[PDB]
């Protein structure tokens with residue numbers, strides 16, 4: 001009982017782009033760019049779409065870096081998130097009614113104001129590792145258990 005989602009991190013050698021979500025999903029946390037894959041769309045197309053729609057950036061190459069399955073206790077649908085990274089972008093990120101984009105130096109990532117699972121996988125992302133992960137959450141703030149392993153093939 002899963003539903004497909006994309007998540008894109010715009011990661012250049014000195015810095016990463018995150019957006020503060022002003023409302024709705026993930027509000028009040030620094031998020032990457034992503035959402036539900038639509039009907040007739042490949043996962044990679046959906047990721048490019050979500051980045052563009054949400055960030056204002058246009059991406060050339062996307063690289064798949066991970067898959068994370070989220071379980072929220074009591075919610076029937078598992079969220080199957082396909083995670084991608086790019087360093088080849090065009091444009092300037094645009095602040096909108098839904099999000100406030102900001103660049104962070106890699107040693108100043110705001111983990112305290114991010115989803116708590118990010119402290120586990122973001123360091124793999126930053127070191128160019130690919131991963132499979134699973135996080136069981138109670139509410140949005142508590143990780144009950146998780147697994148996370150590095151893989152050769154996402």
Ligand SMILES: CNc1nc2nc3c1[nH]c(=O)n3Cc1cccc(c1)OCCOCCO2
Nearest residue numbers: 005006007031032033034035070079115117
């Ligand atoms: C940078 N880390 C995270 N960024 C986001 N959500 C994040 C990030 N880390 C995280 O746990 N989430 C929540 C989450 C949970 C289930 C499905 C999800 C996201 O779909 C991926 C699309 O989410 C876009 C919002 O960005």
